């Protein structure tokens, strides 16, 4: 009966972690940031509206130049916009119209997309022979593609609905490393600013911090009561925020190994589809199911603004690397640039 | 601005191509195909003619898109909202697996998935087309085996006319939204025809209702 003995040891070992986590909880984030002054009411206006998508927009990503962005939609098109002049730089038709994620290479020469086809496709923007063409199709995942982020010009990391995350090498198209340990579908991922670790939110209401080099899980964070839909890294890189289906947000610290603040309101009963931090990390922008994108003052966990300009679910969210704009996509097939 | 004026007219050339593709895509009927794996979706697809499977067929100058999601084996609720907006849902259930088990018999396993799909928050007004396949195997199997193994509360003669109509009535009883959506039930044989006609008739009723929504009557 070694199975029972292993389970008993696991329960005792799990209780040790909870005791250790509670020991280091000297105070609360709210108590520490009680003396600081609130940011006050924050108002943002729609500085631009990008039209041309004829279906629900499921993902978007900013370029490193804070000027170009790529957006995905279920009409089967990958459009590259010029956020300054609304001009459409490119329009890439996808083989499968069921696309749930986007990525823009930090170099800027590649974009990636994936979805229900379980394949992550890489496109070459800077092709000398005319227009944009596909470069590599990365296959090997069993479930749908939830997220994908370009580590470099030749390395990408993807999270799928088969409870696994994978690291690929674009040149050969093979999985260098496979990250396992989740029990539910992984719904999002976010690389660190150092691009040495990345977190992932799963449907098991757990967040796992991985090491890209070694390939093993380092920490596991719990506290959410439903599927985690969004994750993002703090600009520092030692913290991250999660957005789950229970209409709540939580801030986790890598060193503290426990949740610090909770961003929820009694008037909100709708889940969260996307989260993103500002350049300073003082603002946490979250896209909700009530057609409204909310701005949370992360230090004090108080609402500070509402981006009410969409007529349907806000699916995707992004903040420029320069920090001077916020792009918000939604299911009404429109992208809006704010402030 | 000479280069800027040339960039603007390139965006305009992109815009006209997006609209041209949108016009073509709006004229195609999107159907979602579901089942229990061995329920008979493979033979259903041939009658009309990993990841997601797209089937293309036309009927009476109408183009249909059929999507098979039987190779997912993941959390349905995390990708089932992508199919909100389909003309109809084609559901396949085998009538010969009432006694076979996957424990639990296979017939009730289909009932669990049918109940979740029919009463889904996303599918509140989409017509559901129910196909009861393997009616030929169910013909002979009911002669040698009774239906009491599947439904212990069944009280009727073990004939095809009485037993099959009981299974169909049981499936339609799970429809809680009896006034916002309609469930079409049809009986499918291994070697039969006019199945695509039944799907064509059902989508036209969806189209007629959609037309009466633009005009404001319905």
């Amino acid at each position: 009966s070694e199975l029972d003995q292993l389970r008993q040891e696991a329960e005792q070992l799990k209780n040790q972690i909870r005791d250790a986590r509670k020991a280091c909880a000297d105070a609360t984030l709210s108590q520490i940031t009680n003396n600081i002054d609130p940011v006050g009411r924050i108002q943002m206006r729609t500085r631009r509206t990008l039209r041309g998508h004829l279906a629900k927009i499921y993902a978007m990503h900013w370029g490193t130049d804070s000027r170009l962005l790529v957006s995905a939609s279920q009409d089967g098109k990958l459009i590259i916009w010029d956020s300054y002049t609304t001009n459409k730089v490119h329009a890439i038709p996808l083989r499968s119209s069921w696309v749930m994620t986007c990525a823009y290479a930090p170099s800027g020469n590649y974009v990636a997309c994936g979805g229900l086809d379980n394949i992550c496709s890489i496109y070459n923007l800077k092709t000398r022979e005319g227009n944009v063409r596909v470069s590599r199709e990365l296959a090997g995942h069993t479930g749908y593609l939830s997220c994908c982020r370009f580590l470099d010009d030749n390395q990408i990391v993807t999270s799928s609905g088969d409870t696994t995350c994978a690291l690929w090498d674009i040149e050969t198209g093979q999985q260098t490393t496979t990250f396992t340990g989740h029990t539910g579908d992984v719904m999002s991922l976010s690389l660190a600013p150092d691009t040495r670790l990345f977190v992932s939110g799963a449907c098991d209401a757990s967040a796992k911090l991985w090491d890209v080099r070694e390939g093993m899980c380092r920490q596991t964070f719990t506290g959410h009561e439903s599927d985690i839909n969004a994750i993002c890294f703090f600009p520092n890189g030692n913290a991250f925020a999660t957005g789950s289906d229970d209409a709540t947000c939580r801030l986790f610290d890598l060193r503290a190994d426990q949740e610090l603040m909770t961003y929820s309101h009694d008037n909100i009963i709708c889940g969260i589809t996307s989260v993103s931090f500002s350049k300073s990390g003082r603002l946490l922008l979250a896209g909700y199911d009530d057609f409204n994108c909310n701005v949370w003052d992360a230090l004090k966990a108080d609402r500070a603004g509402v981006l009410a300009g969409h007529d349907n679910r806000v699916s995707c969210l992004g903040v420029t690397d320069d920090g001077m704009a916020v792009a918000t996509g939604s299911w009404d097939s429109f992208l809006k640039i704010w402030n | 601005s000479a280069e800027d004026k040339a960039a603007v007219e390139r965006s305009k050339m992109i815009d006209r191509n997006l609209r041209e593709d949108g016009e073509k895509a709006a004229r195609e009927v999107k159907l979602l195909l579901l089942g229990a794996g061995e329920s008979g979706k493979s033979t259903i697809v041939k009658q009309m003619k990993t990841g997601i499977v797209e089937t293309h067929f036309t009927f009476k100058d109408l183009h249909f898109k059929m999507f098979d999601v039987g190779a997912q084996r993941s959390e349905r609720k995390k990708w089932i909202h992508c199919f909100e907006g389909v003309a109809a849902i084609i559901f396949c259930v085998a009538l010969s697996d009432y006694d076979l088990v996957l424990e639990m018999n296979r017939m009730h396993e289909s009932m669990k998935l049918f109940d979740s799909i029919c009463n889904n928050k996303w599918f509140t007004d989409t017509s559901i087309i129910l196909f009861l396949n393997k009616k030929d195997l169910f013909e002979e199997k009911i002669k040698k085996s009774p239906l009491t193994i599947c439904y212990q509360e069944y009280a009727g003669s073990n004939t095809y006319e009485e037993a099959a109509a009981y299974i169909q009535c049981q499936f339609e009883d799970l429809n809680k939204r009896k006034d916002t959506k309609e469930i079409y039930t049809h009986f499918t044989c291994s070697t039969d025809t006019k199945n695509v006609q039944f799907v064509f008739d059902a989508v036209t009723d969806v189209i007629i209702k959609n037309n009466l929504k633009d005009c404001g009557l319905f």
Partner: single-chain antibody
Amino acid sequence: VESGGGLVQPGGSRKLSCSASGFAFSSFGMHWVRQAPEKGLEWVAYISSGSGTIYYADTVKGRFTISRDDPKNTLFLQMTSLRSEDTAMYYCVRSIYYYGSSPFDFWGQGTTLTVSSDIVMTQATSSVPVTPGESVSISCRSSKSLLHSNGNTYLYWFLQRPGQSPQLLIYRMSNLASGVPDRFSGSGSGTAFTLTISRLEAEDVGVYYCMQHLEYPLTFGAGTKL
């Protein structure tokens, strides 16, 4: 690759052709820059992508005609009244315009033909010593400051090696083209520009031309031979 055209004619009219090959010709705007037997290059015509806007040179406004056929990937140039000045080697140049594109990147082989306001680019210097291994700098000037409000200066640098078509080195006065070695560098102040070569090589010899793209009646600078 691209080439094609006629060679000889007394008076009357002649028609030039180009054959695009394997670069998605339908999404590129094409020019017809020509070069006199011993002078510098001179712009002739232009047709946009999809056959939209069309521009002609002031000296060939009525006599010339430029048209394209996206099927079969062919670019035309129809000339009706061919005077004595119209004796030059006609080049075919591609250019694509989006946010970060590099226009005038590829130039055709070109064909010769014989018969038997605007912005003036000075480029005062004409010839310099050909001693290799040094740091040669090429100066140039423009009539007006070609710095637009969006923040980019539309000055292009072309190198014509002896015996072949011109090759683009620098576009928008700061950006290096594809395939160009990192030795070439370009800086300017909107009105006066310079092109810097760190270490001269054996293949760097030739005439270096400059072009502008602010106002469309665009002119060259007669070159600076090495």
